[PDB]
Amino acid sequence: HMVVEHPEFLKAGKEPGLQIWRVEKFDLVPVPTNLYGDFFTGDAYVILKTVQLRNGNLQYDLHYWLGNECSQDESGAAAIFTVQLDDYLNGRAVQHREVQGFESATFLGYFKSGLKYKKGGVASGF
Amino acid sequence: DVQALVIDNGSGMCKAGFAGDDAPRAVFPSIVGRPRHTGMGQKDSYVGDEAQSKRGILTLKYPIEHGIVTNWDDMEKIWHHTFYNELRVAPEEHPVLLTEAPLNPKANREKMTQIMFETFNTPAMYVAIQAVLSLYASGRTTGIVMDSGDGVSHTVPIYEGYALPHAILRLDLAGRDLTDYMMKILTERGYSFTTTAEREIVRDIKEKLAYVALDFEAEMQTAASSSALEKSYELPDGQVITIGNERFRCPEALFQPSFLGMESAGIHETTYNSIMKCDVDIRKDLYGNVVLSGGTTMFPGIADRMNKELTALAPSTMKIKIIAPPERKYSVWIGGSILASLSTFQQMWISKEEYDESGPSIVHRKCF
Ligand SMILES: Nc1ncnc2c1ncn2[C@@H]1O[C@H](COP(=O)(O)OP(=O)(O)OP(=O)(O)O)[C@@H](O)[C@H]1O
Ligand SMILES: [Ca+2]
Ligand SMILES: [Mg+2]
């Protein structure tokens, strides 16, 4: 009787590009596009990179980024939302765990000028 | 708005609480007691701490064995108690997330579902695999969880959020066997612990003083050569006893099950064997994300020892990482609390409406 209704899922992975959400109290909240690449070390984020393939289908890489100080509800939620988004995208996404200071070359490469860290973030949902 | 409940039904201890809390509100023995003789103490049944305390007039039953429900009448009594006495809720008012052991029989998942909806009239429910909840609690979607509780230890490989059932293995040894083994080896020193209160003493000795030796042979030699590893323990009556190599011999049984006369491989080999049952292309990610969960993983030294043993089994260029969160006695419950709190989970539960249309077998389509 249930379909995926989360507004952000309906927006996810529709066209080539980068989309970033932050975990805020057990919800997935879009990051303003002008703040892309500035990560709060107290928070966890989900990043979807969508690339156009030659047959016009879309390639997905889902990265969940975990700040050094993010709380367990945030990192746990980031991991679960990543699984849910992959399921929503028909299992077409490769999932990548990205830890502050140890991110993959691929993830770092998304940010043309280099990603930046800043202290702080939104309060834990616990 | 609507407040979900989270219940992790362990073979030894039930952990129950409210989604969005960082810890279970109620942690109590998974025991039902009934009047021992059919002749005060006078209620039809008792559950949890009160049943244990009244054991002198009650016969005690443990309806969960190896994480699998073996007596549904007793399990229903435990859940009724959990809702009405431990959580102080009306279960008809709350979605309920329940946990299940890896490879829980199909008929059992259906029975769980039938009881929630038909006996408790829950408006919604969901069943999650314990190991997967622990992995989520550690902030990962891929890894292998070594979950060791009361009667059984499971190794559960998980890739991108889903367990790989063909690669799940088990060692039929966990905390109750280690308590029983500590009881046996303490008799060598002349200390007889045989009653329930005495077994509880032994459990406390295991929980407070035992540790996993990094090098067992070397630790035995150190213990034989001097008193450096000895520790004193005060009994409730006030007597002080001395414990030596029993401290690390007890949890050594996890790595050497022959100590208990079992032919099974130790937990390190079980973990390795599960990894080797998985697609070669995911094994790197499993070795690099070995997550310990459950009460019997709480021994000091266990993560160092797992690291050593898995490093010896794997190719030398493989990065081994053992993740042993301090909260790992509760990581299943915590994973549940997070999952049940997500804005997306209202879309995931089995609703009463769905149950009414499809019956218990809906659980195989909604929860996997
Ligand atoms: N600090 C500790 N050190 C060693 N063992 C411990 C510690 N704390 C608890 N235990 C043991 O953990 C066991 C209970 O573990 P846990 O609560 O994870 O099991 P369970 O969930 O009831 O069972 P299962 O998951 O096997 O159905 C008991 O045997 C207990 O003595
Ligand atoms: Ca935060
Ligand atoms: Mg358990």
Side-chain angles (χ1 to χ4, degrees):
Chain A
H1 296 199
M2 300 168 193
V3 298
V4 168
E5 292 172 10
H6 195 289
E8 289 306 316
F9 278 45
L10 307 179
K11 299 194 208 152
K14 286 191 95 180
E15 70 183 352
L18 196 67
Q19 292 169 295
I20 304 182
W21 297 272
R22 182 170 64 161
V23 175
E24 303 180 16
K25 297 180 187 286
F26 301 115
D27 196 17
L28 200 62
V29 178
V31 171
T33 51
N34 72 337
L35 291 171
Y36 275 23
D38 292 346
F39 291 98
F40 277 121
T41 60
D43 283 340
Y45 293 78
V46 173
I47 297 89
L48 174 61
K49 177 66 192 296
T50 298
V51 171
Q52 195 165 106
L53 296 166
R54 69 174 283 171
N55 79 338
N57 218 328
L58 297 168
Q59 155 194 114
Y60 297 123
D61 283 273
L62 267 168
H63 304 253
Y64 51 113
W65 185 95
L66 304 185
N68 182 59
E69 298 97 40
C70 72
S71 56
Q72 183 167 33
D73 61 299
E74 284 165 333
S75 51
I80 300 169
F81 282 134
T82 294
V83 175
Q84 291 180 161
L85 192 42
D86 193 3
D87 285 350
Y88 176 80
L89 301 169
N90 304 115
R92 286 180 62 85
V94 181
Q95 298 178 18
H96 303 268
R97 182 168 183 266
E98 308 289 356
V99 171
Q100 180 189 325
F102 299 93
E103 304 94 329
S104 66
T106 296
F107 185 75
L108 295 168
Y110 297 157
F111 308 92
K112 290 166 70 286
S113 53
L115 61 74
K116 282 93 182 170
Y117 308 145
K118 55 195 178 175
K119 297 294 294 200
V122 51
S124 174
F126 272 157
Chain B
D1 43 83
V2 195
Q3 172 64 69
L5 308 180
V6 175
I7 298 159
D8 176 21
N9 286 111
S11 311
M13 299 287 303
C14 179
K15 294 89 169 175
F18 296 90
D21 287 356
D22 68 353
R25 291 275 171 91
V27 178
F28 60 91
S30 188
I31 295 169
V32 176
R34 289 188 177 84
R36 183 179 294 195
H37 292 126
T38 71
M40 194 135 165
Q42 107 294 142
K43 279 207 300 144
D44 291 291
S45 68
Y46 296 72
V47 172
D49 294 310
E50 195 179 352
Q52 171 76 347
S53 64
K54 291 184 187 182
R55 59 187 179 264
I57 57 174
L58 300 175
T59 169
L60 306 189
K61 301 199 70 173
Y62 302 68
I64 302 169
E65 171 65 352
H66 301 155
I68 309 305
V69 176
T70 66
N71 190 303
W72 291 102
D73 288 334
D74 292 341
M75 189 69 236
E76 206 168 62
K77 294 193 163 277
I78 291 178
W79 284 325
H80 182 276
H81 175 84
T82 300
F83 291 134
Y84 287 100
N85 303 142
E86 298 285 347
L87 300 178
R88 314 219 333 95
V89 296
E92 62 270 25
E93 304 300 338
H94 302 267
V96 176
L97 179 156
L98 294 161
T99 75
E100 64 172 354
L103 308 175
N104 191 27
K106 158 197 148 265
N108 292 46
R109 318 186 71 233
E110 293 182 8
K111 188 60 172 185
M112 296 168 85
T113 302
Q114 181 177 10
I115 293 168
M116 287 297 132
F117 286 115
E118 296 185 13
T119 297
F120 298 110
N121 196 26
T122 52
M125 64 93 71
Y126 189 86
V127 179
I129 297 177
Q130 291 153 11
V132 177
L133 294 184
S134 290
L135 189 69
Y136 290 158
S138 81
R140 314 166 150 70
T141 71
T142 294
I144 178 170
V145 171
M146 201 295 295
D147 197 16
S148 187
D150 220 59
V152 68
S153 304
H154 278 101
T155 49
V156 179
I158 299 160
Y159 187 73
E160 289 198 350
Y162 290 85
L164 307 174
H166 65 276
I168 291 174
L169 293 173
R170 93 184 198 166
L171 172 63
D172 281 338
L173 190 172
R176 74 177 182 206
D177 307 283
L178 298 185
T179 294
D180 291 353
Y181 185 52
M182 188 65 92
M183 281 168 96
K184 174 181 167 287
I185 66 186
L186 288 172
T187 77
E188 286 169 33
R189 267 183 195 264
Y191 308 128
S192 74
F193 289 109
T194 59
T195 71
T196 295
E198 291 169 349
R199 184 165 187 281
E200 285 170 359
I201 295 185
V202 177
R203 189 175 56 234
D204 194 51
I205 289 168
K206 179 191 68 171
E207 297 181 356
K208 284 180 168 37
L209 303 181
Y211 68 93
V212 174
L214 185 59
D215 181 342
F216 177 68
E217 310 59 38
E219 206 73 0
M220 287 293 283
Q221 178 173 351
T222 301
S225 303
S226 78
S227 76
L229 303 175
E230 302 194 346
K231 216 91 185 178
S232 285
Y233 182 86
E234 197 197 343
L235 302 190
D237 79 339
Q239 200 195 337
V240 173
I241 59 173
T242 288
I243 175 181
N245 64 16
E246 294 89 355
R247 294 180 67 198
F248 57 90
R249 279 163 68 201
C250 166
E252 187 61 22
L254 288 163
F255 303 87
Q256 302 193 59
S258 63
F259 280 21
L260 318 187
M262 292 178 64
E263 288 169 334
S264 295
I267 53 165
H268 56 301
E269 271 198 72
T270 309
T271 302
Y272 175 77
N273 289 343
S274 278
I275 293 174
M276 294 303 290
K277 278 169 135 56
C278 293
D279 180 337
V280 202
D281 292 333
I282 77 159
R283 297 178 194 155
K284 184 180 165 187
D285 291 331
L286 302 177
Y287 281 119
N289 294 280
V290 180
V291 175
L292 305 187
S293 61
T296 294
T297 70
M298 294 295 295
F299 295 98
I302 199 174
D304 285 341
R305 175 70 174 281
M306 281 290 296
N307 182 67
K308 182 185 156 194
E309 298 294 350
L310 277 185
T311 293
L313 286 166
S316 77
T317 51
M318 185 56 73
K319 172 177 156 59
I320 307 298
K321 184 175 180 182
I322 310 303
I323 300 104
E327 74 282 2
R328 64 190 176 276
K329 200 187 291 187
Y330 292 158
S331 56
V332 172
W333 190 91
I334 297 165
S337 180
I338 298 165
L339 180 58
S341 295
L342 300 189
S343 58
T344 45
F345 205 73
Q346 53 189 303
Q347 295 139 61
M348 321 253 58
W349 59 47
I350 301 167
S351 65
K352 177 47 127 297
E353 185 190 334
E354 289 169 317
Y355 178 78
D356 285 343
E357 176 164 4
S358 318
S361 64
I362 197 161
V363 67
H364 314 304
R365 304 175 56 217
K366 298 274 275 187
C367 304
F368 79 103

